[PDB]
Design a protein around this ligand. Sequence first.
Ligand SMILES: *[C@](O)(C(N)=O)[C@H](CC1CCC1)NC(=O)[C@@H]1[C@@H]2[C@H](CN1C(=O)[C@@H](NC(=O)NC(C)(C)C)C(C)(C)C)C2(C)C
Ligand SMILES: *[C@](O)(C(N)=O)[C@H](CC1CCC1)NC(=O)[C@@H]1[C@@H]2[C@H](CN1C(=O)[C@@H](NC(=O)NC(C)(C)C)C(C)(C)C)C2(C)C
Lengths: 306, 306
Amino acid sequence: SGFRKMAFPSGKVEGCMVQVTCGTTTLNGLWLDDVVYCPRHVICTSEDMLNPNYEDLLIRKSNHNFLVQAGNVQLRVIGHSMQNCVLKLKVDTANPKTPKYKFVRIQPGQTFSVLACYNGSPSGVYQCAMRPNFTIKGSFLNGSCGSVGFNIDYDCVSFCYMHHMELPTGVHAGTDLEGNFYGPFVDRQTAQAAGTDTTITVNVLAWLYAAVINGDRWFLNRFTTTLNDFNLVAMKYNYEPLTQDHVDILGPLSAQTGIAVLDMCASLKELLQNGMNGRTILGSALLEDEFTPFDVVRQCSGVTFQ
Amino acid sequence: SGFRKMAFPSGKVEGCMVQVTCGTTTLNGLWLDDVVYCPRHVICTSEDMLNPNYEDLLIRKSNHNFLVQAGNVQLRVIGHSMQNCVLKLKVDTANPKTPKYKFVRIQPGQTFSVLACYNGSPSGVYQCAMRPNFTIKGSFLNGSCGSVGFNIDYDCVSFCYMHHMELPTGVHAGTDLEGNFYGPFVDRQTAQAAGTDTTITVNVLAWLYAAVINGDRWFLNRFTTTLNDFNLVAMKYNYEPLTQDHVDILGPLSAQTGIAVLDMCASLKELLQNGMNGRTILGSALLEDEFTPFDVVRQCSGVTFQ
Ligand SMILES: *[C@](O)(C(N)=O)[C@H](CC1CCC1)NC(=O)[C@@H]1[C@@H]2[C@H](CN1C(=O)[C@@H](NC(=O)NC(C)(C)C)C(C)(C)C)C2(C)C
Ligand SMILES: *[C@](O)(C(N)=O)[C@H](CC1CCC1)NC(=O)[C@@H]1[C@@H]2[C@H](CN1C(=O)[C@@H](NC(=O)NC(C)(C)C)C(C)(C)C)C2(C)C
């Protein structure tokens, strides 16, 4: 019983966090095997910022301009390269704590855990989603750049996010671990329009199923809807279109609860049109969209990690 | 920028989680040095449950009736004792991953991180508060007993909760790591009245300060209130009394924001009386009470852990 915004256990990632310094700029890096990955803007000066030429900036640097600190221990940089918006620092020592890992570029609507760090030291862990507009609503202060997002599957850490910047609305932008930004963003100080966000419909449906699994049925109704008629209402409320593939993905939850997907869509329609009239669902007065179908199955089923 | 329900990094605790089996009952234990701590009801049969005599039950057990598994490795139990509602299993091997630790019995209104585990393996981490009625609103399934709650301060893990049981409302009850229940609960299957819960006023105020720090002032007003007149309104809305000690604890946040505590109390009063009229605070449509003053300072300041 219960339902919480649950992060993955962070231990496998904590062992990979380091501090990278170049000049007066210090941020975090990710140490896997003998490579440290970090945002390339570590190489920039404040005045380099409106349109840095990173190729030009990096050619002017030497291995010895990079200081990497793992705990108390300085790691010697023996090589460096740039891949998209990430810098790869080859170091003299392979990380003995390297977990089994992969790099993944996630789709909008997928969730991940963030290990927020400062000066190479973990501060906290929380769950995020990749928004439809390719921002994340994180909690990041000065010094958190290079903090990473991840998912865990059995023993394998799948890294999917590295933090780079804050947008004027207070939301966050960054890259995959190959250095490609999510969204239209670039690592320069130029005005940058974040698209208008939308609500992740398939996730709202997943969380309504979680509410049912946990014993709460008050928002259910006797109605059904067609997919087409549901999507007409979704559009009006700034919800993402629901596809047949989303319907299929919700199959396991529909089967467990005995509530067909399009019957749950009729409940969501009624909630969008009527509100909650002072009632809550899983302790929220808003419809929650940062749980995927898999997140619900995981937490209502008790999957663990090796 | 941003504000999330943030847990502590769990790595130091993950290294301490083990599986304990006695008969047909399997749950989690906490392995520190050469001792494994777990709920004493691991020794019970289903039929032992309405009023077990645990002294009588334990005298009938031998070291070899306890199976402890750390990962793939079986640890030999070489001694056993009962302390209140926890069983202490002395094992042949000291845990090489034992962190610096303490055991703490927390006050109602304090928060902690839970590492939910199953069969000795961590599943996820989330933040909880000890409610005024000494329950927690966790996420726990069959097999999660023996999962622990904790706080971290520099390098020191302060354990404060071990999970034992679920109450009929879906909330959770358990003990400190010395085996004393929080609240009036006992580890038997007898009807057990959980008191009527209340909202943690000092924490709501802390979270309103967090909202201001993060740039949002819409709920502020020009009014002030006396403590006495605030508490008269608190009572009507089932909020805990605010004391002068709470006011003092909110000092740092009041100083950082330039908003006196009793001025923030006037904003909360107006929110209780008027509602939010369709507005949100830090992404919530409800007033959030599971952040302490210290949690806010930590997350709006970037404290890390050694
Ligand atoms: C990280 O590098 C770090 N040291 O932790 C840093 C975190 C931010 C949070 C305060 C400092 N990231 C940057 O400084 C990043 C680098 C420049 C400027 N950056 C920003 O995040 C700025 N945002 C911004 O310029 N947004 C646009 C471009 C107007 C949309 C800040 C004003 C928040 C510093 C680059 C290379 C993008
Ligand atoms: C843990 O032992 C475990 N194996 O993980 C287990 C978790 C619960 C969640 C389903 C099993 N805890 C117990 O089984 C615990 C033990 C008995 C019964 N327990 C309960 O939690 C029961 N609740 C209960 O009896 N509540 C009262 C007493 C009516 C208020 C369940 C009905 C949830 C099993 C004891 C010793 C309390």
